[PDB]
Design a protein around this ligand. Structure first.
Ligand SMILES: C=C1/C(=C\C=C(/CC)c2cccc(CCCCCC(C)(C)O)c2)C[C@@H](O)C[C@@H]1O
Ligand SMILES: C=C1/C(=C\C=C(/CC)c2cccc(CCCCCC(C)(C)O)c2)C[C@@H](O)C[C@@H]1O
Lengths: 239, 10, 239, 10
């Protein structure tokens, strides 16, 4: 057996959307408030995350079917999955040699400690690094990585989603595209699909922990003032 | 509300 | 005649508050989103203005009497005068040689054109530069400059102020301190006080124009997203 | 409201 034209077009559109919304040089990082090493890394990391939300929105808008959902479902899906898509996309900068995200030079090399200086704890950072190491070891094809992000985004089990039948259908269409890609194009991927679906479960708990820690930060006006309007809106409680 | 997100989704 | 102990203590406290909230080296400017020359200067200038609001709050809290007002009057006074205090304090960086604000190097030298790239027009920038030139020519003593800022801050004629009798009294106490300072300590200041009070009238119209232009910017989510939580709150319409 | 301003005024 082989992939159909429709399945192939889905892969093409997703890979192109990722190439359009992810810069491997990290050249836009010089435009953020600079890194500093009380929560010295918060301005830089808030700017980094704000920039990445914009990219995730860019990517999302090109996922086949996403543009057809209501502005409400689009927002509900973006709000609840943004941090998970940010965690997935960050894997491309993660290095197993130094257990860090390497984004250009000495300034943009981020370790656990730097994120601690952004108001985060090891209750989040220890499983994040473990998730990063695990996902990195899966040696995903660009097609699988892009499909995993789109699958994550289109999870119907999110607070605020209204049309859980239409989102579940788009997600299943994407899950079949992934399953077939691994079967046809990935030699030795016999257990990959399962391992990948298990990574989405990991993201849910990482998401829960981030939200808790973010709520703490967002409630202290001296820290919330260092965030951006986009971060506040996306990670905020408004309906 | 979601003014920014609405704009960014066009 | 001469200044009294009380009048002298007011001058001492104000000069000290300004020395504590104004850096002549402009060394904190490297921590802002960098200048770029669609509204390329907005991130840098929003960060600059956000930083300056913080300083104006710092200064305000040390103006004798201000701390005794209700949190409501303190907010109402800060909200409506912030841009005027920013305009006054910026005079210390204004240069008559190049008609610009020189804050360190080639990156932090700001001309009319740069502010145009922050969503502002010549309807604001032409009278601003004319105001800057005029105030600069007054060759104010540090004591007069600090008194002018405090006088501006304590203007009772502001939207939202409740105790206009207590604010008017603090402002008059400060106006007498200024009048006496010029009389005793400023040789040739016979017409200075009037010229200074006239600069406050200029600030009202500059404030009105800035608010109009800012409302335009703040209504476009692509521009409002580049502002900071502090700028949005201070220049915002909430009561 | 004015959460930031309130904090900054202590
Ligand atoms: C964000 C990206 C990169 C690194 C990511 C990283 C590591 C720096 C990270 C990712 C997700 C979550 C976290 C921890 C929370 C960040 C702080 C966000 C707030 C809103 C303050 O809670 C770190 C770097 C590049 O791979 C681009 C990618 O989009
Ligand atoms: C702000 C300061 C300095 C320069 C000031 C300057 C000239 C750069 C300026 C001042 C007031 C108003 C304006 C124009 C409006 C700025 C943009 C603000 C928003 C909220 C986007 O409308 C420029 C530089 C230093 O003197 C410190 C001082 O506090």
């Amino acid at each position: 057996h082989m992939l159909s034209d429709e399945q192939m077009q889905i892969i093409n559109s997703l890979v192109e959307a990722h190439h359009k919304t992810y810069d491997d040089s990290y050249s836009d990082f010089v435009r953020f408030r600079p890194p500093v090493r009380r929560l010295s890394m918060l301005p830089h990391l808030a700017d980094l995350v704000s920039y990445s939300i914009q990219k995730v929105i860019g990517f999302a808008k090109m996922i086949p079917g996403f543009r057809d959902l209501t502005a409400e479902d689009q927002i509900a899906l973006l709000k609840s999955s943004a941090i998970e898509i940010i965690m997935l996309r960050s894997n491309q900068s993660f290095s197993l040699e130094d257990m860090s995200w390497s984004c250009g030079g000495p300034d943009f090399k981020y370790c656990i400690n730097d994120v601690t200086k952004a108001g985060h704890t090891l209750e989040l950072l220890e499983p994040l690094v473990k998730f990063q190491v695990g996902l990195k070891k899966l040696k995903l094809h660009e097609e699988e990585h892009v499909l995993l992000m789109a699958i994550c985004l289109l999870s119907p089990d999110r607070p605020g989603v209204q049309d859980h039948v239409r989102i579940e259908a788009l997600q299943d269409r994407l899950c079949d595209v992934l399953q077939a890609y691994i079967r046809i194009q990935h030699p030795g991927g016999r257990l990959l699909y399962a391992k990948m679906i298990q990574k989405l479960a990991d993201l849910r708990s990482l998401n829960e922990e981030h939200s808790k820690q973010y709520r703490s930060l967002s409630f202290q006006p001296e820290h919330s003032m260092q965030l951006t309007p986009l971060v506040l809106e996306v990670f905020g409680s408004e309906v | 509300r979601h003014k920014i997100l609405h704009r960014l989704l066009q």
